[PDB]
Amino acid sequence: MRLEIPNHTERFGVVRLHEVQRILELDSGRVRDESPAVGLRRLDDADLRDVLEQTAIVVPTRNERLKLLEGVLSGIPHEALILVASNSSPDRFQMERDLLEEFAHLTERPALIFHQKDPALAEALRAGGYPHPIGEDGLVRSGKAEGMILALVFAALSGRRYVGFIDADNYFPGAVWEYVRAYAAGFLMAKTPFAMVRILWRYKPGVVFRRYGRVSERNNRALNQLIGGVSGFETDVVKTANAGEHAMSLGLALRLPLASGYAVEPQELVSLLELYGGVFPLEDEEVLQHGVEIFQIETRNPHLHENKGDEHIRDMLLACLATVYHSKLATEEVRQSVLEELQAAGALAPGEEPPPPVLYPPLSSLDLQAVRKALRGHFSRFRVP
Amino acid sequence: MRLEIPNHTERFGVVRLHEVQRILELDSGRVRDESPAVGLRRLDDADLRDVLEQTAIVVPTRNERLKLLEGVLSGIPHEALILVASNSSPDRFQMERDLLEEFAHLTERPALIFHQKDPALAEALRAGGYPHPIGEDGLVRSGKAEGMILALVFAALSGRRYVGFIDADNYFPGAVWEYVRAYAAGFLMAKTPFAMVRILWRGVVFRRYGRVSERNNRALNQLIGGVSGFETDVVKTANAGEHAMSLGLALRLPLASGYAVEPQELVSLLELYGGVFPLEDEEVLQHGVEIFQIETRNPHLHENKGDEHIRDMLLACLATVYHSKLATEEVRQSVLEELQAAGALAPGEEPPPPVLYPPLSSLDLQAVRKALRGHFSRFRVP
Numbered sequence: 093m094r095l096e097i098p099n100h101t102e103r104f105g106v107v108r109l110h111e112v113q114r115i116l117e118l119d120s121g122r123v124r125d126e127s128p129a130v131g132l133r134r135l136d137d138a139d140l141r142d143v144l145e146q147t148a149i150v151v152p153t154r155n156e157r158l159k160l161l162e163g164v165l166s167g168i169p170h171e172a173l174i175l176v177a178s179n180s181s182p183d184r185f186q187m188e189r190d191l192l193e194e195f196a197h198l199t200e201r202p203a204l205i206f207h208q209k210d211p212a213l214a215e216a217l218r219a220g221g222y223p224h225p226i227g228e229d230g231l232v233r234s235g236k237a238e239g240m241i242l243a244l245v246f247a248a249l250s251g252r253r254y255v256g257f258i259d260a261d262n263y264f265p266g267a268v269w270e271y272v273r274a275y276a277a278g279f280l281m282a283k284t285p286f287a288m289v290r291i292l293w294r295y296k297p298g299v300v301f302r303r304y305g306r307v308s309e310r311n312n313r314a315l316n317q318l319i320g321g322v323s324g325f326e327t328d329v330v331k332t333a334n335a336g337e338h339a340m341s342l343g344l345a346l347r348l349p350l351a352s353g354y355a356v357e358p359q360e361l362v363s364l365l366e367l368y369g370g371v372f373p374l375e376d377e378e379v380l381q382h383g384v385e386i387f388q389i390e391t392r393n394p395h396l397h398e399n400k401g402d403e404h405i406r407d408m409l410l411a412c413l414a415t416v417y418h419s420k421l422a423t424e425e426v427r428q429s430v431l432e433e434l435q436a437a438g439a440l441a442p443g444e445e446p447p448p449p450v451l452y453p454p455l456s457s458l459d460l461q462a463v464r465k466a467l468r469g470h471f472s473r474f475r476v477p
Numbered sequence: 478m479r480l481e482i483p484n485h486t487e488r489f490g491v492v493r494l495h496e497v498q499r500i501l502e503l504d505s506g507r508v509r510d511e512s513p514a515v516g517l518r519r520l521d522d523a524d525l526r527d528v529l530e531q532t533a534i535v536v537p538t539r540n541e542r543l544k545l546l547e548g549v550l551s552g553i554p555h556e557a558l559i560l561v562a563s564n565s566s567p568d569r570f571q572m573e574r575d576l577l578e579e580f581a582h583l584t585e586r587p588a589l590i591f592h593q594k595d596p597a598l599a600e601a602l603r604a605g606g607y608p609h610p611i612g613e614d615g616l617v618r619s620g621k622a623e624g625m626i627l628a629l630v631f632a633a634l635s636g637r638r639y640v641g642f643i644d645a646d647n648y649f650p651g652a653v654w655e656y657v658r659a660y661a662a663g664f665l666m667a668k669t670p671f672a673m674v675r676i677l678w679r680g681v682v683f684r685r686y687g688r689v690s691e692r693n694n695r696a697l698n699q700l701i702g703g704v705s706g707f708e709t710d711v712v713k714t715a716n717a718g719e720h721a722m723s724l725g726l727a728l729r730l731p732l733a734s735g736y737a738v739e740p741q742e743l744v745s746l747l748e749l750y751g752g753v754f755p756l757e758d759e760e761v762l763q764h765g766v767e768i769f770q771i772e773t774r775n776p777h778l779h780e781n782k783g784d785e786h787i788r789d790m791l792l793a794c795l796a797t798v799y800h801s802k803l804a805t806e807e808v809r810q811s812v813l814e815e816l817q818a819a820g821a822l823a824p825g826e827e828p829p830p831p832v833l834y835p836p837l838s839s840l841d842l843q844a845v846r847k848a849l850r851g852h853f854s855r856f857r858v859p
């Protein structure tokens with residue numbers, strides 16, 4: 093894989109937020125006597141795989157066609173561990189388990205699968221002193237976030253260094269291969285234990301392709317405005333406010349609180365800034381000397397995700413602007429810019445005070461020993477030989 | 478890369494057609510010390526690339542969005558030599574030359590490019606003892622087939638062993654990568670110098686394209702059964718835009734003109750090496766031909782929704798069979814019926830015997846190498 097080097101890179105405390113990098117070549121081949129370029133990076137097959145050998149790929153699903161999910165699976169590079177994080181209907185979940193098993197079996201690779209609403213996991217969490225995801229029903233709430241949270245836990249338990257997420261509503265397995273390799277590419281270019289990689293795909297000049305465009309644009313702005321509010325300079329750096337397909341080294345993943353809804357992606361960035369932007373004093377000694385790199389990689393393969401959702405669009409916007417409005421870094425100027433976008437579209441007339449998004453605190457607080465203690469008689473269930 | 482094992486294999490003279498194989502895993506990793514076997518084919522990354530280091534990948538284009546073509550290029554595995562065969566308008570060709578030059582420089586890899594209507598090549602072919610694809614104007618005829626012929630000449634010259642084709646109307650570089658890894662996957666599983674790999678995929682739109690290719694496939698299978706004496710289901714890639722072949726094979730093979738290119742490749746295989754007619758080629762007699770058919774995980778999602786061509790595609794293919802020297806009266810009539818049934822005059826129906834260029838083997842490479850001497854500069858994207 094050959095990417096561009098980011099021409100500029102926003103600095104913000106110890107966070108280093110790189111400008112978008114285009115991928116020029118999907119597959120760079122095998123390094124020998126190559127002539128060094130200063131404007132782009134070639135990443136060697138070998139090293140990409142070695143990185144993927146330490147990488148967990150979470151595939152979250154809630155009643156997604158089986159064909160699709162199989163498609164996605166066949167597309168994940170061999171070296172990565174697969175975790176299906178399911179929340180499907182009980183029937184479908186079984187079908188998913190059998191699907192994974194055929195797959196892991198035939199391709200001689202380890203995987204894990206689990207279900208969001210599994211009581212075993214709920215007590216596991218709670219024993220490890222992490223009761224926050226559980227609901228009135230005594231089970232973990234439905235929500236992609238809560239699924240990811242549990243996937244993070246497995247990632248942690250399985251000793252993988254990096255976690256990446258790939259959505260299962262992906263028609264193109266070849267795409268998935270790229271996104272996953274691009275994660276590994278990010279982590280290679282990184283020179284910090286604490287790295288994040290976010291995939292985007294921009295569309296350059298309708299119903300779906302048109303008016304979702306102008307919302308990510310707005311969403312992206314509100315992040316840049318948030319940064320601007322602090323540095324005292326405008327910036328156009330953030331282009332991945334929502335980035336479903338994103339990855340992070342586990343060391344950083346466990347450090348970040350997560351939000352509940354569509355708010356999840358945007359929050360991560362806000363969190364990073366609040367935590368490591370040098371404004372509030374910084375506790376974490378190992379981050380203060382290594383810093384955080386954030387990569388934004390522009391993929392060669394389009395994001396084609398099936399749907400039939402309109403009111404997901406409104407919400408997406410709403411959630412992003414919420415996380416910014418309620419940031420401890422939001423200057424008075426930003427807060428109002430944001431509130432005006434909201435009202436002037438769809439949310440509370442007078443009279444707006446957009447719900448503060450609700451935040452699970454970092455997993456760094458979950459005693460992993462307790463969890464290991466608590467699922468001993470079960471780990472062979474989640475595990476798919 | 479992991480694939481299914483073909484669950485059967487038609488033997489026809491020394492030709493072996495494999496039943497379709499699904500790719501199960503796009504990327505099987507590095508086989509480093511690994512316990513092999515099971516009922517699938519696993520192909521090591523290292524072996525795959527060593528094969529691509531011997532592979533030319535031809536990208537034909539007539540007047541296609543540049544952004545599409547950059548895409549396609551970006552998906553070709555690094556090891557593979559890129560040949561852009563152009564027949565675009567004067568203006569565009571320039572832009573294409575630039576595009577490629579940029580890409581190859583930036584990614585440090587050899588490419589070549591030519592225009593189908595370049596006079597220098599027409600002179601070269603005529604020198605090579607091969608005037609056949611030249612039109613009246615004195616320039617090479619338009620049509621994809623003619624482009625491929627030229628690209629094969631470049632392939633032979635560049636001394637690569639294996640030639641793959643990839644159409645540029647392709648929206649997903651990821652798909653492109655899978656195709657080219659599949660071509661290598663094919664050649665790796667072959668136990669012969671003479672191998673061929675053919676890729677396929679599985680409103681009221683694509684219903685039209687379906688029933689016709691299943692009809693094109695059926696036609697080819699009928700060709701086979703009429704000879705063997707027993708019906709077969711095996712040909713599923715009568716049309717195969719994305720295909721590859723070891724070069725040794727390609728130069729032995731006479732090429733048809735229209736949408737006859739793909740079907741005719743199979744028919745000529747069967748006629749030359751099916752054991753019916755005298756087969757004299759000490760090497761093919763002794764090594765035989767393997768044809769693979771690989772079902773890809775990534776959809777063929779191209780730039781199209783037009784119906785005039787579709788009929789023509791059917792007519793083309795059914796003609797190649799009708800006019801085969803292997804067709805039986807039964808096989809002939811069955812074609813004629815479908816072909817009238819769809820679109821073709823009631824009485825006087827005898828679909829055009831397609832026109833075929835003789836094998837490229839019948840060409841002197843040193844002659845063309847002499848003739849292109851002052852010109853290699855402009856073809857090679859230096």
Ligand SMILES: Nc1nc2c(ncn2[C@@H]2O[C@H](COP(=O)(O)OP(=O)(O)O[C@H]3O[C@H](CO)[C@@H](O)[C@H](O)[C@@H]3O)[C@@H](O)[C@H]2O)c(=O)[nH]1
Nearest residue numbers: 152153154156177179234235236239259260261334335336
């Ligand atoms: N474990 C779990 N998985 C879920 C849940 N709900 C959905 N999923 C699965 O996780 C993915 C969520 O995808 P969608 O339901 O398609 O959400 P979306 O509206 O397409 O939005 C996505 O893309 C955006 C683009 O960057 C993202 O902003 C967003 O977070 C999300 O990933 C899907 O693969 C789905 O099958 C859940 O409650 N729990």
Ligand SMILES: Nc1nc2c(ncn2[C@@H]2O[C@H](COP(=O)(O)OP(=O)(O)O[C@H]3O[C@H](CO)[C@@H](O)[C@H](O)[C@@H]3O)[C@@H](O)[C@H]2O)c(=O)[nH]1
Nearest residue numbers: 537538539562563564619620621624644645646716717718
């Ligand atoms: N060099 C050259 N290229 C051409 C010419 N005409 C078309 N091409 C290019 O070669 C490819 C042929 O694709 P289309 O022109 O889109 O043909 P099609 O009707 O889409 O059919 C394609 O797909 C089918 C899939 O198996 C095939 O059956 C068919 O042969 C062809 O590849 C495209 O990249 C096209 O721009 C030509 O005269 N010369």
Ligand SMILES: [Mg+2]
Nearest residue numbers: 259261397398
């Ligand atoms: Mg989706």
Ligand SMILES: [Mg+2]
Nearest residue numbers: 644646779780
């Ligand atoms: Mg086409």
Ligand SMILES: [Zn+2]
Nearest residue numbers: 098099100111
């Ligand atoms: Zn810049």
Ligand SMILES: [Zn+2]
Nearest residue numbers: 259336337395
């Ligand atoms: Zn996506």
Ligand SMILES: [Zn+2]
Nearest residue numbers: 485496710711
């Ligand atoms: Zn069969």
Ligand SMILES: [Zn+2]
Nearest residue numbers: 759760763764
């Ligand atoms: Zn021999």
Ligand SMILES: [Zn+2]
Nearest residue numbers: 644718719777
């Ligand atoms: Zn195709």
